[model samples]
Target: KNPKSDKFKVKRFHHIEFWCGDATNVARRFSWGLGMRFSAKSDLSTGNMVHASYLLTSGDLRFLFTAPYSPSLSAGEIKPTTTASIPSFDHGSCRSFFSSHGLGVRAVAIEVEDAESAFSISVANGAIPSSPPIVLNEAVTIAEVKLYGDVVLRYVSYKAEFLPGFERVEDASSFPLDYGIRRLDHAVGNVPELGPALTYVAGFTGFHQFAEFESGLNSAVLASNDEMVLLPINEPVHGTKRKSQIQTYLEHNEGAGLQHLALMSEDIFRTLREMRKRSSIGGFDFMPSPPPTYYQNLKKRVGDVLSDDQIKECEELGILVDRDDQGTLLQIFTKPLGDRPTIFIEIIQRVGCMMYQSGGCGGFGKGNFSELFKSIEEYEKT
Candidate 1:
């Protein structure tokens, strides 16, 4: 194959941008946790004033977290613009995201071949289009908008053109990176009795429903295709165990924005273990302290795909798994960043598919939202 094939220049995703309370802390922890060393840090006065950019890499994938340059905006101050910045049901807004499981209401990212064309096509069909693309750096530019109140959609574009010696090469020694996740992996959105609204999103975007889970697999739905994007429409369920953390965020945010970005990994067990070991010493701040039963049930659920012992290993390491026709996948999300529970990290491992596989419709059972809310209600009475 020619080294300079046109296919190489067709353009592919370069990095992901997330806003968190402590960019440095998050960067350091994630870097150390993934065994990824800091590659570079730069000071630029482009967006606001005095923007400090931190870069961390694991294999071919590079992830960046940015905070405002305003010294006045302490890491804590950098959150969803306002408690009301997001749309909420308390306000009687019938947004698709606000009503889902009381949490995970946020944007799902999409990177298309043509930004202007894609933006126009989406908006013309009733999708909310955000104004002005923010050029973070020469290599990355992003446009964000709130789509139909409940959903926040981001259109990101990147150029390979970089300064001299500013090239990133995938190194085998580095942590596993799923470069194949070049589009939308999957996004979480919540709404009441979501079938109609979710079907609406699918029709509008030509995205089909890939998976649906009720109760144990209930209230969760995945819509996707060959593209790296998977939109998971959510609904609330009674007696769910994973309600505490999610509800706390939903009640606080009042609506939905962007919940988590599930970055794909090739090796589930290995990458998760690597991250776990690093986190044990110093890695990304822990998010959910999932229940012990999470792993115990995982073995039984995954069955032959992953042995009982393998499931135990994942549970012990805080990794979660789900099975599909392609194979099995391991994934987990970081704790919310802001007081509103806006942004976080989602790590994933695609077990056997050469393609980006949607694990059983892409819904990981309710970690316990129903139970948490019930318990919270009980505690409030006391």
Candidate 2:
């Protein structure tokens, strides 16, 4: 809605793409294990012989992960085409990307007003163009640019039911629905240094800073004018008491990359309860709770935002509660999704804010960042 409101006005998150080793295994864990419906897919059976793509949805959250077939088969299967209608599918680069980042986010797509204009503006600025705008089927237009490390920042405009090159997954709605996830609150990327990375994003995309905090990892949040999309950047502090969290991620991931995605939930306590029930059967395993003092002093810190019952429930469930001047936020983090410690997940529930608004009343969980660092740092020491 930026009528000169903002040029690179990202409407919403189109989808987050993960380049991995096994798309089926990763998608199955999110579908059967985490309660997200397997909504769509594009695979060898569907003419995507080069790679297998599986898309899942939870509320407005759409996660698509892809893994390419072995290079021997994919090298010939993916043809060199002059048609702009065809996407540049990963031929053998998937293996190289997987080797560098392990299982990590390869693309972060945002719904922009016009793909060509968006690409032109960014390239006119300091952004390095990855792939220029390509129109497909007259229903979708897409472009890509290099993000930090190897991840690509994609701009897309579409009116179709699903992304092009994908088909609806039959019987997708038959799965059990127990989670209350709503939409993406934010997605985070970790870098070797903050200034250049943040500056690059600020210059190319017109996102301004929303919040900044420092606790071993200096962090900042940047958002679109509408605030529908939030991308936070974090880097390890220059000189720290101990090896910090993002440092570990940088080491494991081999460079700057999308570190974790935070998903908004209508009811975190209830959603986490159902998630826990599935943990023993290949679901997410959340990080442990803070020390008893963090919970015992919660009433004094949060100051009537949460009832004693709510605080007690959070203490039992390892949920974190943080209240800013405007609203309250409850958050919890899950363990890394793959063998490497690069990518994890966060579940957040907002209270006291307009839940459906792009900029909700609830603020980011700054208060919990202190404690959350210690939890993960302790685990890294293991």
Candidate 3:
């Protein structure tokens, strides 16, 4: 645990931004595939000529997508900002993220009490500033601080309308799969070492050590005081018999970056089924089923935490189940979302853990990790 002061505070995650090659098509896939509704957008027609931005929303979750406008396609170069401190048309960050990481996260935006103070305190405490804070509208101010790999931790104060110049998207379809995804349970990242990663984050954000594990991968789960935001950082242990699976993530990603996101779901069975029905559009290719004996013995290990029917359904959907002292966890992982094999999404549901009120069961499941590691071993290239 680092010195997380009471001075600067974060309420929750405002939104997570993705840098995609084509924001329009990518946003459509999310709307059609994950059932997130089209919330708003900013682009050429919205008086923003720098990039196309789309916001997808479901409950408290907001995902932003941005893709730069090609210089060649522009009628003329996007005008430089008139103000002295204001940075002009973003040409590097968006394109660099897409070209390097493919369709992956660029910024994890947190809703803070004061954006300027958050930025000031962080840099004063050794946090590197990516960019200075800027006020968007009256209620909105934002700043950027460097994070793992190409990603940035964005400090956004107020207000979920998102950055300046975005308008509410009307005429969006009312019908949705409503796949039951409620919010982000946790966002996991793969770094070179667990110690440095944990120190770096907690040093600035004041996140505390919630849980950890060392089943080949060095793990640390960090959380805010409210425990609303969970970040589990992992590193590969070199001397193990099998190479750490995280090493593969580092190689494919070409550096340390976000490995997966565990999005909270009300029901895994219904949500995964709905996601599959959209197979051709936004469907996800999940990790394969565990060995036949794994689920057969799941009952004995968890001692009837799940019924016969629940176990059968988990087997049918290739989902994994494990329990901590607090509650049972149901989870399944997808293959990479883009070509780099760098990013994937996890659908998870917390069951029977109200006594401890922990969203992270064991920070992750031991049994489930082994199954996922076995799946990764099958295709890992030296």
Candidate 1 at residue 175, lDDT? 48
1-382 per-residue lDDT for model 1 (tens digits): 1122111111333455444434577676556665555555543422222334455665555555443344443334333332211111112222223344233333344565544555555566555555445444345555545543355565656564321213333354234432232222455654444676565555445555554232322344433344334556544554666563434434555643444656666655666666655554755555664566555555556777777777777767677666544455567776553344555667776556444343333344343344333334533444
Q: Estimate each model's TM-score.
A: 0.61, 0.90, 0.88
Predicted candidate 2 versus true structure: per-residue lDDT over 1-382, tens digit per residue: 2322345657888788888789888988877556788888888777665678888888888888888766564554334442112374555567889987889898898888888889999999889998888877678888999888888889998755566677788884446454888777888999999999988987898787774224668888777887777888899985677778899999889989998898888888888888888887988888876866677668887757888998898888888887776677888899998898879999888777464553634666776767555545544444
lDDT of 3: 0.75
Error of 1 at 20 (Å): 4.0
Those runs of model 2 whose alpha carbons end farther than 4 Å from true positions after fitting are: 1-5, 71-86, 172-176, 212-214, 358-360, 369-382
* Candidate scoring better on lDDT of 1 and 3: 3
Give me the displacement of residue 102 in model 1, in angstroms: 17
* Candidate 2 clashing pairs, residues 3+ apart or interchain: none
**Best-fitting candidate, scored by TM-score:** 2
User: Which should have the higher TM-score, number 1 or number 3?
Assistant: 3
In order, candidate lDDTs are: 0.48, 0.79, 0.75
Better of 2 and 3 by lDDT: 2
lDDT sort, best first:
2, 3, 1
Count of backbone collisions in candidate 2: 0
Q: Which sections of candidate 3 miss by over 4 Å?
A: 1-7, 72-89, 173-175, 213-216, 239-241, 280-282, 355-358, 370-382
**What's the true lDDT of residue 350 in model 1?**
54
